[PDB]
């Protein structure tokens, strides 16, 4: 029982006990032909019918990816590792439906992050049964190919055209348009939300005309398509295809001859070589990711945003307080999760070489000067704080603000937030602060489960974030307009208002990081 | 009558009616042999005795110099023009003595400014009879050679060794040591005070060991030896000697052969050519000025200050609010004293080329970025204000602070001020603000004369400035320590306290222009 008839066949789900209520979950529904052998590196193929009833009571396979092993046994880094079998057969999606079955329900579609090299929708931190139970929305989750298997690019070649992972997400959005009405949802009321590389993916759908009728609104959590790490140039993506082929002995005279050889190698052989296709690899380097392929993306996001060519709708964008601290541990000299990581002035200068290898020896002296105007000249952690703000401002915070500013410049309602609560359950040290990716547990309502022992102020904060996230998806406004709560105002290009999120109280502020953002936007391009 | 016996002969002065009292003035006392013919370009020669009584009841000749004719009839620019005959016979000094004749009186020695190309001690704005009457100090004034006649440099050549004008001032200080006791003064209680190029001259005496026993303390008004315009390099001073010789047809095989030809030309012929010895001349370019001659100055001031090699004593340093506005009128495109001078963004960019011709096209983009962080983005006079602050910070304010900071770093008491009152009698337009050189009328007590129609608040401000100036000369502390007045604290390298001067009330502030000074001191040297 619990049978829903899709356009490709019947599926069977489960009923889950969630907070004294029931939520219907369909885990592991296929939405594309398995990209195997002949179909590796190609765009996803639409499914045909299946006979019988597909039993969707199980989290499906995770896409082929390397696993973070920098800290064995550490929950802070292994919580982002896949919790299902790794396989190329991984194009599946999940649906959570509130019980009893709703009618014309708002849909929220999650796109996970992972630097376009890792990630899966089955992580317990992405479980949408809490959102479906508390906010009565339908939550859809999806797995898309990462690494070379999802973004190996030979522009113009249909055997490996690039942006395959973005086409995986797009076909899952096509499945929602065709089938979500059978589950009780409104295909004209779908909101995309995602984090990190998932937020860049969400904003890339705003810039892809083919995805425009597949969703209504968008939520960008700590990421945007115009971030420096998001979209690489087509010739840079092409050079990484050859380098991978050269590493695997697949260098050939002909383009398809390269693909034919790569299709014969084991998926692990490809995974074991993606790290060596970039000359100088920064901890924020995307080995294989989105590019300008001429199909999903016809130009660089900065060019498309300037021309105003994007989906005209409302958006919700925001960042965390300490966005860059997580990446300082993974390769910046002098940093560690096992001590306070007080670094010298020269260690700061080596850190900027780690993150900015192509910047002139002059240019890093410019970054040094703009970030050493110490409030207290004798705070020992002055340089450790500065390098974290350098990574946070350039790679995440400032690009997120420019994306919201450009949407407001074209008459679209944007809502900016600033998440500044360090989780009591955060496994990383206290000096790393409100880290990259640790607002997701609050977005999905994990503090509401009392067995995980979050504070009562965290359950209140999570409940308000879910209410603001779901209200924006339902109505385009993340506010409860009458109960005399704090009203989240519209982010304007002028006043630049934004809302804080913490256990204390939500406050209205203006021009977030406006000073340091002016450096990256008006002086850094001039080297 | 009124006869004083000097070491070279008797002099006769006058008694002046000053505010219902008398002040004895000796105007035009010679202190060196006239630097004529054989003595042109050489260091001043000490005087021999004269028979009879030199009648010192007349302002002496002004040194040969060009006259500002940019605005005919304008009092704001012609008030700085000489008011006596121009002649090479100009090494004379003035003494003002309070009546009745005092005993062991503190002496204040004024050194005028004029960019080392102009200036005279006989200007009504430098009259020291008010200071002598009100504060009971002895005021000494001096004329020194300017232009090529005072700073034509051939390093190591006693026919034209350079820094002759600084040696003119030094011999006048030697005269004070030898003769001021006959006038009622204490040679061990002499304070040098000066403005603009006179303040750089004062600080250069702090850096010249030969001048150390010739004074006790120093007051620096809108100028310092470490200012970028103060001291030019010996080979740059040498190149300007040849260029002047080449302009006058005096190019020769031999060094003294050049001097012999230049000694034959008329003094006006030299004056008519000093403007063309510099390739790109900024409005703050010193055609012929101080250099490292190995005698008066053995190294650059920045090097001497770093090594701590200077006269250890108390100093009083300060600047005006709008130091750079005067120089924008004399050659910056888009500025004029007859309108509000609202300039565009490109006019600002041309202004930085006018003042920074040797700075890379890159480097002026750096100055552009640091000075365009507008408070109000739509103030029309935003760029006009920015260019005035660029000239004021780099050429005057920040070097004055570094000079006081380095003195405090070596355990010397420094007192910094910030003059921010626009004179009611200021002839220049209102947009130029508290301009360069318009605190001198208050230092010399001109507002006390009621026939000049200053406001009552200006007489109060002038009286307090004279009291602070004279108290520092007498005691080393510019404060009246008990009458519950505002206590001027010591300028420290840390807290960086300074005092404001205006008609409202004197207030204590900290770290003046600390942000923009950090740009010129820590980033601009790196181009
Ligand atoms: Cl399944
Ligand atoms: Cl419902
Ligand atoms: Cl509930
Ligand atoms: Cl092979
Ligand atoms: Cl492109
Ligand atoms: Cl005379
Ligand atoms: Cl007296
Ligand atoms: Cl009086
Ligand atoms: Cl000749
Ligand atoms: Cl030198």
Author numbering:
A (entry chain A), B (entry chain A): 3 to 529
Reproduce text from the manuscript describing this model.
However, its roles in decontaminating toxic circulating compounds such as nerve agents or cocaine, hydrolyzing the “hunger” hormone ghrelin, as well as being a potential drug target candidate for late stage Alzheimer’s disease have been demonstrated. Attempts to express human BChE in E. coli were not successful, leading to isolation of the enzyme as non-refoldable inclusion bodies, certainly because of the presence of three disulfide bridges and nine N-glycosylation sites that enhances the stability and solubility of the enzyme.
While no BChE activity could be measured in the total soluble extracts of hBChE-wild-type (WT), hBChE-1, and hBChE-2 constructs, increasing activity appeared in the remaining constructs in correlation with the increasing number of mutations, and maximal BChE activity was detected for the hBChE-7 construct. From crystals grown at 4 °C, complete datasets were collected and integrated in space group C121 with unit cell of a = 160 Å, b = 75 Å, c = 122 Å; α = 90°, β = 93°, γ = 90° with a resolution cutoff of 2.5 Å. We found two monomers in the asymmetric unit and statistics for the refined model are presented in Table 4. The overall structure is very similar to previously recombinant human BChE solved structure (RMSD = 0.452 Å). Analysis of the crystal packing showed that each monomer of the asymmetric unit forms the canonical cholinesterase dimer with a symmetric mate through the four-helix bundle formed by the 362–373 and 516–529 helices of each monomer, as previously observed. Active site residues and residues forming the gorge adopt very similar conformations when compared to respective residues from the structure of recombinant human BChE from CHO cells. Apart from the mutated residues resulting from the PROSS process, the main difference between the structure of human BChE produced in E. coli and the structures of human BChE produced in eukaryotic systems (CHO cells or insect cells) lies in the fate of the Cys65–Cys92 disulfide bond. Taking account residue occupancy, this bond is partially broken in chain A (about 30%) and totally in chain B. On contrary, the two other disulfide bonds, Cys252–Cys263 and Cys400–Cys519, remain formed for both chains.
